[PDB]
C-alpha cells in the first residue's frame, strides 16, 4: 500500500505506481514526475502543483489514486479497513468473519431487504438505476469502493457476504448506461488481477449495453486498452461469480464474467436482455429483405420496424435463451440473489485452478 | 455414379472437396480477385511453405434454424482452418473468408477456430490467424458471443507460452477485434483492412462525429494514434514476408530456445577484430551534447545487418524490434535522440 | 402479469420454475408414484440433506429439429443436476428422467450432466449419478454419442480423485 501525504516529486512516484494501492490526501499531497516550473519553462504551461498533479486530478484524470482522502485521519482509515479485507500474501486465504448459520432453503430466509431488490429494476426498458442499490443489499453492510471518482461508469470494491471477503466489479446504469470504455476496462481489469493475486472471489454485477461509441475511444485505445478486462478475467482462478440484472449485449457480455470466460456461477435476473445486440438496430439484418419489401411492395417501415422490434425483443432478447444454452447456471428472482451468492461462495471455497507453466503471460499494456 | 458402390462415395467426396473450394459459387472468388485482394485459402496457401497445408473442418456446415438461416450452409462455414510449415517449423493457421456471410462468426465457424487454437497449445506451436469479417453472425443468436469468448479465453491462457501473430487484411469490426489484442502481434494492412469495435454509421448517429471506416481504424490510426498495430504492410504480400521475418526471430514455444543461425569464430582481442563499420562509431556521437543524432545508426552498426522493426510509426522516440548479433536474436530498446531529443512518453 | 413488466416478467420465472417439477404433466408423476417409485427429483431430495439441493440448468431444453421432435421439448431435457449436502458435507449430483423422452441422453441433458461432474472436480467434492433411462436418443444423432464420450472421460479424469 503506498500513502502519499505530501508532494512526491521525481522518482520517488514510481514506487507507489508498482504497488498494489495508492491512497492520496486531497489538497495536502501531489504526485508528479516533473514540477511546473520545469513544465513552463519548457513548454508555456502554468499550472499550480494542485492541479498538476493533487488527488482531484489523480483520482478522477489519470486514475492511478485508488482513494482521496478529505483528512490524513481519513486516509489511515481507509488503509486500516482496505487491509481488513486482504490476506497476509497470496499464500493465506483472506480473513473471514464470523459466517451466519440460517435454516434454508433461501426462499424460505428472504429479508424485506431482499425483496426489494424484486421491485428495483424499472418497467421502463432504458431508464437508469443506480447498481449501489444492489451492492448494499448484496453484501453484509460497508462497502470500501475503490477508485470511486474515476470512470464512474463502472463500480468496483470490497465488501463481504456472510462473513467472507469479495471483490465487486458491477456496470453503473447511471453512467453512460452502464458501458464500457477505456477507463472502466483499465480499472476492473487491475482490480479484478488484484484479487486474484489475493484470492479475493470475484463478483459480478452485469448491466452493460456494449461499448461507449466515439473517435476518441477507437483513437485512444480502446481495442488495446479495453482488451485487458478481459485478460484479467480469463487470467483469474479465484472463484468467480457473475450475475445479469438486466442487459448484456455483443461483446460486453464476454468480458463480463461471462461463463466461457471462465466464470463458475452465472445467475441472471428475469430483467436480464441477453442478447447479440438490441433489437432496435437487430432487426435491420436480421428481417433484411423482410424491410427491403417495405420500401418497394407494401410500404410503412417505422410501422414494421418497430412490430418486429417487439416479436424480436420479446422472443430471444430475453434470458432464456442463453439460460437454455448453459451459459447461465440458473435464472432466479433478484431477492434470492444474497443467498446465491453465499452457497455459491462456500462451494467454490477450497476451488483447485491450475493456469498453463509459463513466467508470464502478455497482456495488452 | 452409384453412390452405394464404394467408388460412388469416394467420388462424392471429391464434389465436396471440390465444392469447398467456392462455398459461394465461382462468381464469389471472381470479385475477390477483381478487387485485387486474394482468397481466404489463397492467403494460407501465400504465407505458408508451398504444399504443406492440411486443412481441417474443410466440409462443416453451419446447423441453424433461424431466420431462415437453414437456406443458406456454405461449406467451410466461411473459415479456413488448418496447420503447416513456415520455413520447415510447423505452425498453425486459420483465415477468414469475408464472402461467406461477411466473415461473420458462427457456431460451427467458432468451432473451427477453437479446434486450431487447442492444436496450436498442445503441439506448443506458433498460432496465425488471419482476421477479416464483420461481427458476430446475429441470426445464430448468443451461441456466436458464446463462441467468443472460448477463442478469446485460449488466447488469454496461450498469452506468453506460444507466438501468436494476428494478421489483419479486411475489415474485421466488432468483438472480433478483440481476438488480435490479445495476441503477441499484429499486422494490418494500410488501407485494406480496418479494425474497430463500433461502425462510422453507429458513431455517427450517437455522437454526430462524421468518420470514415478507414479514418476511424485503419493500419495507419492503429499504427500512430491507438498503438495497437505492430507492423502497416504496403500490401498483402509483404504482410506476409513481415510474418515470416517476425517468426524467423522468436522460438516455437516458451519452453524452447529462440533459433540461432552460425556464429563466427574470431580470434580476439576485440581491439584487433575492429571493422571499418565498428570505427565509424567512434565518432558518430556529436561534439555538441544536444545535437540530435539517428539511434539507428548504431543499431545497424551492432548487429549482422538487417533490423526488424516493431511499430515503427508509433512513439518514434524510442526504437524497438529485432535483430541477431553473431547469429544471436535479440531484442533492441533505444531512444530515438531525433525525436523528443529522446524523452521517455507514456507511448 | 403484463410480459413487459419487471412484475410480469418475475411472474413468468416462478410459472416455468413450477413447470419444472413435471414437464411432461402431473399424470406422468402419478405414474411412477403408482408404480412404487419416486420422481428423479424426489431421489435427490431423499439422499442429500432436507432444503440443500440448489438445481442447475432447471430450464433447460433440447434445441433438435430432427423427425419432429422439436414439438416436445420438456425442460430439465430428462436430468436434474445441481448440488447440495449429505450429513453436512458438500456433494454434486444428477438424477435421469426417465418419463422425459424414456431418460435417453440428448445434446443438452448431456450437457448438464457435463457441467456437474466439472464443477465436482473443480470443487473436490463427490459425485453422486443416479441413473434411469434408455441409452441415446436415435433422433438426435451422433451428437449423443459425442457426449457421452465426454462424459466417460470427465469419469476417468476423476478417477481416484473424486469418490464417484
Same mark, same amino acid.
Given at each position: 500500500?503506498?500513502?502519499?501525504?505530501?508532494?512526491?516529486?521525481?522518482?520517488?512516484?514510481? *514506487?507507489?505506481?508498482?504497488?498494489?494501492?495508492?491512497?492520496?490526501?486531497?489538497?495536502?499531497?501531489?504526485?508528479?514526475?516533473?514540477?511546473?516550473?520545469?513544465?513552463? /519553462?519548457?513548454?508555456?504551461?502554468?499550472?499550480?502543483?494542485?492541479?498538476?498533479?493533487?488527488?482531484?486530478?489523480?483520482?478522477?484524470?489519470?486514475?492511478?489514486?485508488?482513494?482521496?482522502?478529505?483528512?490524513?485521519?481519513?486516509?489511515?482509515?481507509?488503509?486500516?479497513?482496505?487491509?481488513?479485507?486482504?490476506?497476509?500474501?497470496?499464500?493465506?486465504?483472506?480473513?473471514?468473519?464470523?459466517?451466519?448459520?440460517?435454516?434454508?432453503?433461501? $426462499?424460505?430466509?428472504?429479508?424485506?431487504?431482499?425483496?426489494? !431488490?424484486?421491485?428495483?429494476?424499472?418497467?421502463?426498458?432504458?431508464?437508469?438505476?443506480?447498481?449501489?442499490?444492489?451492492?448494499?443489499?448484496?453484501?453484509?453492510?460497508?462497502?470500501?469502493?475503490?477508485?470511486?471518482?474515476?470512470?464512474?461508469?463502472?463500480?468496483?470494491?470490497?465488501?463481504?457476504?456472510?462473513?467472507?471477503?469479495?471483490?465487486?466489479?458491477?456496470?453503473?446504469?447511471?453512467?453512460?448506461?452502464?458501458?464500457?470504455?477505456?477507463?472502466?476496462?483499465?480499472?476492473?481489469?487491475?482490480?479484478?488481477?488484484?484479487?486474484?493475486?489475493?484470492?479475493?472471489?470475484?463478483?459480478?454485477?452485469?448491466?452493460?449495453?456494449?461499448?461507449?461509441?466515439?473517435?476518441?475511444?477507437?483513437?485512444?485505445?480502446?481495442?488495446?486498452?479495453?482488451?485487458?478486462?478481459?485478460?484479467?478475467?480469463?487470467?483469474?482462478?479465484?472463484?468467480?461469480?457473475?450475475?445479469?440484472?438486466?442487459?448484456?449485449?455483443?461483446? #460486453?457480455?464476454?468480458?463480463?464474467?461471462?461463463?466461457?470466460?471462465?466464470?463458475?456461477?452465472?445467475?441472471?435476473?428475469?430483467?436480464?436482455?441477453?442478447?447479440?445486440?438490441?433489437?432496435?438496430? #437487430?432487426?435491420?439484418?436480421?428481417?433484411?429483405?423482410?424491410?427491403?419489401?417495405?420500401?418497394?411492395?407494401?410500404?410503412?417501415?417505422?410501422?414494421?420496424?418497430?412490430?418486429?422490434?417487439?416479436?424480436?425483443?420479446?422472443?430471444?432478447?430475453?434470458?432464456?435463451?442463453?439460460?437454455?444454452?448453459?451459459?447461465?447456471?440458473?435464472?432466479?428472482?433478484?431477492?434470492?440473489?444474497?443467498?446465491?451468492?453465499?452457497?455459491?461462495?462456500?462451494?467454490?471455497?477450497?476451488?483447485?485452478?491450475?493456469? =498453463?507453466?509459463?513466467?508470464?503471460?502478455?497482456? =495488452?499494456? | 455414379?452409384?453412390?452405394?458402390? /464404394?467408388?460412388?462415395?469416394?467420388?462424392?467426396?471429391?464434389?465436396?472437396?471440390?465444392?469447398?473450394?467456392?462455398?459461394?459459387?465461382?462468381?464469389?472468388?471472381?470479385?475477390?480477385?477483381?478487387?485485387?485482394?486474394?482468397?481466404?485459402?489463397?492467403?494460407?496457401?501465400?504465407?505458408?511453405?508451398?504444399?504443406?497445408?492440411?486443412?481441417?473442418?474443410?466440409?462443416?456446415?453451419?446447423?441453424?434454424?433461424?431466420?431462415?438461416?437453414? $437456406?443458406?450452409?456454405?461449406?467451410?462455414?466461411?473459415?479456413?482452418?488448418?496447420?503447416?510449415?513456415?520455413?520447415?517449423?510447423?505452425?498453425?493457421?486459420?483465415?477468414?473468408?469475408?464472402?461467406?456471410?461477411?466473415? *461473420?462468426?458462427?457456431?460451427?465457424?467458432?468451432?473451427?477456430?477453437?479446434?486450431?487454437?487447442?492444436?496450436?497449445?498442445?503441439?506448443?506451436?506458433?498460432?496465425?490467424?488471419?482476421?477479416?469479417?464483420?461481427?458476430?453472425?446475429?441470426? $445464430?443468436?448468443?451461441?456466436?458471443?458464446?463462441?467468443?469468448?472460448?477463442?478469446?479465453?485460449?488466447?488469454?491462457?496461450?498469452?506468453?507460452?506460444?507466438?501468436?501473430?494476428?494478421?489483419?487484411?479486411?475489415?474485421?469490426?466488432?468483438?472480433?477485434?478483440?481476438?488480435?489484442?490479445?495476441?503477441?502481434?499484429?499486422?494490418?494492412?494500410?488501407?485494406?483492412?480496418?479494425?474497430?469495435?463500433?461502425?462510422?454509421?453507429?458513431?455517427?448517429?450517437?455522437?454526430?462525429? +462524421?468518420?470514415?471506416?478507414?479514418?476511424?481504424?485503419?493500419?495507419?490510426?492503429?499504427?500512430?494514434?491507438?498503438?495497437?498495430?505492430?507492423?502497416?504492410? *504496403?500490401?498483402?504480400?509483404?504482410?506476409?514476408?513481415?510474418?515470416?521475418?517476425?517468426?524467423?526471430?522468436?522460438?516455437?514455444?516458451?519452453? /524452447?530456445?529462440?533459433?540461432?543461425?552460425?556464429?563466427?569464430?574470431?580470434?580476439?582481442?576485440?581491439?584487433?577484430? !575492429?571493422?571499418?563499420?565498428?570505427?565509424?562509431?567512434? /565518432?558518430?556521437?556529436?561534439? *555538441?551534447?544536444?545535437?540530435?543524432?539517428?539511434?539507428? $545508426?548504431?543499431?545497424?552498426?551492432?548487429?549482422?545487418? +538487417?533490423?526488424?522493426?516493431?511499430?515503427?510509426?508509433?512513439?518514434?522516440?524510442?526504437?524497438?524490434?529485432?535483430?541477431?548479433?553473431?547469429?544471436?536474436?535479440?531484442?533492441?530498446?533505444?531512444?530515438?535522440?531525433?525525436?523528443?531529443?529522446?524523452?521517455?512518453?507514456?507511448?
Amino acid at each position: 500500500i503506498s500513502l502519499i501525504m505530501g508532494a512526491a516529486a521525481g522518482g520517488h512516484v514510481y *514506487s507507489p505506481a508498482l504497488t498494489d494501492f495508492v491512497i492520496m490526501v486531497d489538497q495536502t499531497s501531489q504526485m508528479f514526475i516533473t514540477g511546473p516550473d520545469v513544465i513552463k /519553462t519548457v513548454t508555456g504551461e502554468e499550472v499550480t502543483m494542485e492541479e498538476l498533479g493533487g488527488a482531484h486530478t489523480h483520482m478522477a484524470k489519470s486514475g492511478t489514486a485508488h482513494y482521496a482522502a478529505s483528512g490524513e485521519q481519513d486516509a489511515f482509515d481507509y488503509v486500516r479497513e482496505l487491509l481488513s479485507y486482504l490476506p497476509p500474501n497470496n499464500s493465506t486465504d483472506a480473513p473471514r468473519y464470523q459466517a451466519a448459520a440460517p435454516t434454508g432453503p433461501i $426462499e424460505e430466509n428472504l429479508t424485506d431487504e431482499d425483496l426489494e !431488490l424484486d421491485t428495483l429494476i424499472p418497467d421502463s426498458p432504458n431508464q437508469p438505476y443506480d447498481m449501489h442499490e444492489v451492492i448494499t443489499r448484496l453484501l453484509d453492510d460497508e462497502f470500501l469502493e475503490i477508485q470511486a471518482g474515476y470512470a464512474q461508469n463502472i463500480v468496483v470494491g470490497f465488501g463481504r457476504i456472510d462473513g467472507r471477503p469479495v471483490g465487486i466489479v458491477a456496470n453503473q446504469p447511471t453512467h453512460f448506461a452502464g458501458c464500457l470504455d477505456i477507463n472502466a476496462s483499465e480499472k476492473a481489469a487491475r482490480f479484478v488481477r488484484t484479487c486474484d493475486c489475493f484470492n479475493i472471489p470475484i463478483v459480478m454485477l452485469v448491466d452493460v449495453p456494449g461499448f461507449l461509441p466515439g473517435t476518441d475511444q477507437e483513437y485512444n485505445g480502446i481495442i488495446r486498452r479495453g482488451a485487458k478486462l478481459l485478460y484479467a478475467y480469463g487470467e483469474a482462478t479465484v472463484p468467480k461469480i457473475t450475475v445479469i440484472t438486466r442487459k448484456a449485449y455483443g461483446g #460486453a457480455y464476454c468480458v463480463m464474467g461471462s461463463k466461457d470466460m471462465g466464470c463458475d456461477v452465472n445467475l441472471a435476473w428475469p430483467t436480464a436482455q441477453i442478447a447479440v445486440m438490441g433489437a432496435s438496430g #437487430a432487426v435491420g439484418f436480421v428481417y433484411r429483405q423482410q424491410l427491403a419489401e417495405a420500401a418497394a411492395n407494401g410500404e410503412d417501415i417505422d410501422k414494421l420496424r418497430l412490430r418486429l422490434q417487439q416479436e424480436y425483443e420479446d422472443t430471444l432478447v430475453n434470458p432464456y435463451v442463453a439460460a437454455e444454452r448453459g451459459y447461465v447456471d440458473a435464472v432466479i428472482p433478484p431477492s434470492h440473489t444474497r443467498g446465491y451468492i453465499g452457497t455459491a461462495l462456500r462451494l467454490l471455497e477450497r476451488k483447485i485452478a491450475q493456469l =498453463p507453466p509459463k513466467k508470464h503471460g502478455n497482456v =495488452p499494456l | 455414379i452409384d453412390i452405394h458402390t /464404394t467408388a460412388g462415395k469416394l467420388a462424392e467426396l471429391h464434389k465436396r472437396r471440390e465444392e469447398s473450394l467456392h462455398p459461394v459459387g465461382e462468381d464469389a472468388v471472381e470479385k475477390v480477385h477483381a478487387k485485387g485482394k486474394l482468397t481466404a485459402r489463397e492467403r494460407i496457401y501465400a504465407l505458408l511453405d508451398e504444399d504443406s497445408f492440411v486443412e481441417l473442418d474443410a466440409l462443416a456446415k453451419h446447423r441453424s434454424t433461424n431466420f431462415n438461416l437453414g $437456406e443458406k450452409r456454405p461449406l467451410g462455414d466461411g473459415v479456413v482452418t488448418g496447420y503447416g510449415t513456415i520455413d520447415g517449423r510447423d505452425v498453425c493457421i486459420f483465415s477468414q473468408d469475408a464472402t461467406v456471410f461477411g466473415g *461473420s462468426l458462427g457456431e460451427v465457424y467458432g468451432e473451427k477456430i477453437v479446434k486450431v487454437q487447442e492444436l496450436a497449445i498442445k503441439t506448443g506451436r506458433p498460432l496465425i490467424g488471419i482476421n477479416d469479417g464483420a461481427g458476430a453472425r446475429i441470426q $445464430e443468436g448468443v451461441v456466436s458471443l458464446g463462441l467468443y469468448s472460448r477463442i478469446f479465453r485460449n488466447n488469454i491462457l496461450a498469452s506468453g507460452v506460444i507466438p501468436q501473430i494476428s494478421l489483419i487484411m479486411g475489415a474485421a469490426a466488432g468483438g472480433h477485434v478483440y481476438s488480435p489484442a490479445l495476441t503477441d502481434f499484429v499486422i494490418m494492412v494500410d488501407q485494406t483492412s480496418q479494425m474497430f469495435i463500433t461502425g462510422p454509421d453507429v458513431i455517427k448517429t450517437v455522437t454526430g462525429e +462524421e468518420v470514415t471506416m478507414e479514418e476511424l481504424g485503419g493500419a495507419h490510426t492503429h499504427m500512430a494514434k491507438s498503438g495497437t498495430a505492430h507492423y502497416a504492410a *504496403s500490401g498483402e504480400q509483404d504482410a506476409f514476408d513481415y510474418v515470416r521475418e517476425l517468426l524467423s526471430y522468436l522460438p516455437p514455444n516458451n519452453s /524452447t530456445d529462440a533459433p540461432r543461425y552460425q556464429a563466427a569464430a574470431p580470434t580476439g582481442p576485440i581491439e584487433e577484430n !575492429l571493422t571499418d563499420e565498428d570505427l565509424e562509431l567512434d /565518432t558518430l556521437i556529436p561534439d *555538441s551534447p544536444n545535437q540530435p543524432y539517428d539511434m539507428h $545508426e548504431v543499431i545497424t552498426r551492432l548487429l549482422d545487418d +538487417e533490423f526488424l522493426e516493431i511499430q515503427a510509426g508509433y512513439a518514434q522516440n524510442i526504437v524497438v524490434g529485432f535483430g541477431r548479433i553473431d547469429g544471436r536474436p535479440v531484442g533492441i530498446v533505444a531512444n530515438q535522440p531525433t525525436h523528443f531529443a529522446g524523452c521517455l512518453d507514456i507511448n
